[PDB]
Symmetry: D2
Subunit: 356 residues, 4 copies
Amino acid sequence: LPGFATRAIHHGYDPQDHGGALVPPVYQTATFTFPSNPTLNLLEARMASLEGGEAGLALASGMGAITSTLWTLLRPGDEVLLGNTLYGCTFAFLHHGIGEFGVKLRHVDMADLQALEAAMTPATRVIYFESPANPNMHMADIAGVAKIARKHGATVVVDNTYCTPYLQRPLELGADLVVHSATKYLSGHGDITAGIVVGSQALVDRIRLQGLKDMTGAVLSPHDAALLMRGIKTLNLRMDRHCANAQVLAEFLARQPQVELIHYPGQPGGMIAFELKGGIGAGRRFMNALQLFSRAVSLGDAESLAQHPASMTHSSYTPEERAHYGISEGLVRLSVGLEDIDDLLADVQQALKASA
Amino acid sequence: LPGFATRAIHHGYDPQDHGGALVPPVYQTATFTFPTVESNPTLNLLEARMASLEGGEAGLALASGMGAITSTLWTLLRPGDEVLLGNTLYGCTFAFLHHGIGEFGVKLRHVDMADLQALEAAMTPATRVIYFESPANPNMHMADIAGVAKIARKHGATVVVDNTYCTPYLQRPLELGADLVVHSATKYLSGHGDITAGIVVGSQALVDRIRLQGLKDMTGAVLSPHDAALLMRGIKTLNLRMDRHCANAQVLAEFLARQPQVELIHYPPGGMIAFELKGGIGAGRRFMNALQLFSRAVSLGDAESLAQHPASMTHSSYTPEERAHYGISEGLVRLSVGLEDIDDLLADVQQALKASA
Amino acid sequence: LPGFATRAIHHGYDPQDHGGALVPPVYQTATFTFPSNPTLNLLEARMASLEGGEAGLALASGMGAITSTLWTLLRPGDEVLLGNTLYGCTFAFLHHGIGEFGVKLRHVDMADLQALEAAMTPATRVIYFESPANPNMHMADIAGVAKIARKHGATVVVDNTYCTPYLQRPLELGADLVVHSATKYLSGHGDITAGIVVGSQALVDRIRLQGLKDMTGAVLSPHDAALLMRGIKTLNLRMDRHCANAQVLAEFLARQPQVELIHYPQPGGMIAFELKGGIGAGRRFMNALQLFSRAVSLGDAESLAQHPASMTHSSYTPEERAHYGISEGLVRLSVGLEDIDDLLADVQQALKASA
Amino acid sequence: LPGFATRAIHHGYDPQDHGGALVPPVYQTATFTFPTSNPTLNLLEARMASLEGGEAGLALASGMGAITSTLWTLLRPGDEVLLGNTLYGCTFAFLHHGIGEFGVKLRHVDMADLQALEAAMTPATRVIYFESPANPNMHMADIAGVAKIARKHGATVVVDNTYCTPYLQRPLELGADLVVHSATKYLSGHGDITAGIVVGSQALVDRIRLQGLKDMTGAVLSPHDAALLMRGIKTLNLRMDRHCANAQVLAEFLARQPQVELIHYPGLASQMSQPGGMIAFELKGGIGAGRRFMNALQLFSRAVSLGDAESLAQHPASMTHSSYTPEERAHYGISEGLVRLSVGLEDIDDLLADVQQALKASA
């Protein structure tokens, strides 16, 4: 089996099947003569290879991947066990979407196999969670969850967006399906939105012909698929740099007097979350002071991003409501990019002093 | 109000807000800086322009026509609600209803939209959505949208019309009373068969809900800015292309109606034609095999002429009786007449018909 | 032979050769395995078909097409006969570019065969001109020029940008090569820059392997080539509308008191007229336009307008402008595809504001 | 001054000037409203200028577009151009079968030998053009030294920096006047676009833009390709680091193989200054061994280019120069067993395995 880097650049493609083109031609065509799109097929095969899965499916967005998958596997009466902490729109989709169509939802600490097995019911059909989780980015025992899951043949779905198949491969640990917001690290350059699902040919075929075909129509543009593949070609190199930069920044943040503590890392790629002693006011001043980090909500970009939930995404909520969603007043999340670490340290240092 | 052609080229865009660029820059970016309080311009422009063409208040762009339909229905319906559908629908749409949302507690009921008497009789306190294509198979008969709208308001039912076949250039359901219009922009709107996309147009209130609920939470069927830019490029020639599609189809239809191999012409709806081959399924296969200009494919609204014979193509797996149940006769042939020289199209059909014998 | 519209949509392509794709896949690859780019090849073959020529060549821009062609055909000592009036960038290329490398240039009235024949010398190798020409868009006898060129086997090159192969095909009239700024009508949507050269395989091969390969490197991106082919698919329909709109606007402008006369028209959707009020009227006219865009180009879906004296040639003096065939009140319009009633209304109010 | 990686990702762009977009919008428009420049091209140019330490940049349709636009601008009949002993195939063709046929005098000189260069300087010398490093051993030239001589008659020094990229070498900070790049290679890094870049003083670049490009080549770069090039530049430092590491391991391996006569370049660790991920070696078995070696490769691609994520290999004698005779090839610096490799970003163990088996098959 060729190495990860080799497969991320070559898997599934041979120039002679496409006129000798070194780079695969982009099949920007809505239709083909009556007897699949070669560009999407290649992306799917390559992502399947990287995750150690049998088949892949490309979608218009990470949400397209999650919804197409869940709509396929669940029906009224079925139960879904969810990790305690989820993205945002995922939490919304579950509670304000599919959850309002008869599907039962139950949040459980995936870190406690005792509680998980205790929450297992003959109606449980799907176990969905992200690894690691937002809190302190704890890994969670995927193999352990898989063991409990098969009690009622429950399908285990893991959101592997944060790690990418380069750092974690849930399928090799027992998961049935892995989903990605390829919009983040996989693309790596913040210019496209895309989603990926990988698992057995059996499950993926169902999601493709049911969830996607009939219930979401969340198809991915061949042009975007081509750009996503371009990004995947440097995945290993980018993740290495994201991790190194984040490690240095995390160690720096831990020594600063303005920082109460570091939620993570203690590695979640280039992600960091820390707490400002000064709370919401300190967070606002910190964000206003940044000159290199961008004030935005996303991650996995070449550019470093920063967000202060309390004054940004969750500014409308009250302090108590924020706490209920695991959002402290001084919580700051960073997607450390690929810039020179010395410039990133200087930016954070200056902003930290300005936060006072 | 500026003319249709003018709005299809200019509506919603002013070069001054984008560096003086004659053609709007493509915002191929997944994210924007977070609002200071102290949306993607490419998608917003496409949405505003399509809203203008349909005479609606707001527009929403989706990854595909199916993305538009599903995002809309997931938003408006919940378990217990009822949806009245036209008797004949698109394949995937039909499937989405019965094999998709229909399996989540939503009741579906098929009724002849051309029969207002029957429609009114099918209205129940639970009816929340009335969905149909106009025109619809098998004879592309234009349903009375204003009449349906009158009945719908009896229980505040939302009327949704699939306007793919006509495009806003030939029909504008919202101006006739519909609440929402959906499009597979993959067809005529794009016009060049290189992109897949969907559009929903209606009131700001309804579109906002579909955007923030059906799309944001239940489908994630977002449209790529690159594809949106291409769709807008296509819309710039919509009037001219539809004019030619129609002219070519009229000539081919008249020709087909006089040929010995043709039993009848179902229709004439843009450049769409559907006719019956006396020879049935075998004649259909030979006809399809003989075509040299028309392409054997399943779609429509492309610059290239397309042809399909359902019985030996999309519905080849079904039995003759099952096909009939789905409005598919053994000799049914559907044509999406393109923009090629009509003399070349006539010659291709003529020789194929002779070969069908 | 299939009709023009049919060839503009299908010529040179068969889905079977590319995975059954209805639309040709875009070969956005800089390299191919060691034994031509299928996307560029297709564009070239299709343009050759539309012009009635044997071969085509795609370039990064119209200027790329002209320079690549001339650098190939000329060498120090050779003479080039040029039309009395050219684009602008071309005129500069000739005089401030290739002309400073030993190549002799000589302007001649292509409409005057006697003068052209009299300007023919044993050193003449290329006869280059636009048809129609800027002045009053006078067609000019291409077959006549071709007969004279033979005298010393001179190569006749015609810039067919204004007409497009849909309205004029110089090769079928005797020209050796045709060049295009595909940036204009061929693309039709103002989103790409590109050039095209069509002629015999013999000539195009030389231009491809000499002018382009060695002297300009003006290659066209497969992405742009694909967009250009997308545009060509509606060429006949767009040109029909450009022409119809322009005819109506031309008739209107002729009856307006603010207009001295119409230089032209038919040159596609192009119109040129003179404002009685000179440069001041021109400036006010341009400032008032709300639909037409103040820009320098043509062949776009959007209508464009320009007043040379206050725009491209504003730095020159009135006498210098005249030397370049630019009058103080000259206004050029590239009539687009918008609703003619909206275009008439915009021009009408602008003309009243020009006073 | 921000670090290289920071500038390669951010230089010249502020989201607030473009609707807050994190990624710059692509200005795919042929024209703009008449005033009272394309932002996408301008950004690419400013960023490349920053990376090379130059004042201004210019983007072209191809590396050849960059070279021709530059030379057409700077030379006129009677002028003399001093060239490096060995030049890139097409560049050599442009000089001899192109501009060289328009009254411009050409003359090759060993740039590594300042004595010969200084002796080759004439009152007519206007341009000194060369690649650094250059074949056959990829030896670095003393740019500062060449610059000192050039000033004798105000000759403009132009350096093709394609092989190194501004990440590994910056000729302008060494005295060069202009640097040109075939961005088609390393800068893009993914083999999906063709593009050229020129960086130098605002004065020189303005002239090339308004004369060579505007009037003599028309080799403009598509905004779409410019955007892709910028996307590629964002990982330049990381890719070059891997290209270099992979090439070093493969070079050491090749140096120990019985089928290999010698390694032209790179030359051990620290022929100094590794030529990116480029390697050239000689096969003892000549043209026959070269053909078999090439036929056997299963991971490396048989193609003519470099700087791609995918590893490429070529054997000139049986590929680009197959029509020539053995003596003619020698005249062009091509040995019968010469093999050039553009080592890519794949797993080094897979690359080693491929070369290993192809080498055994070459016997």
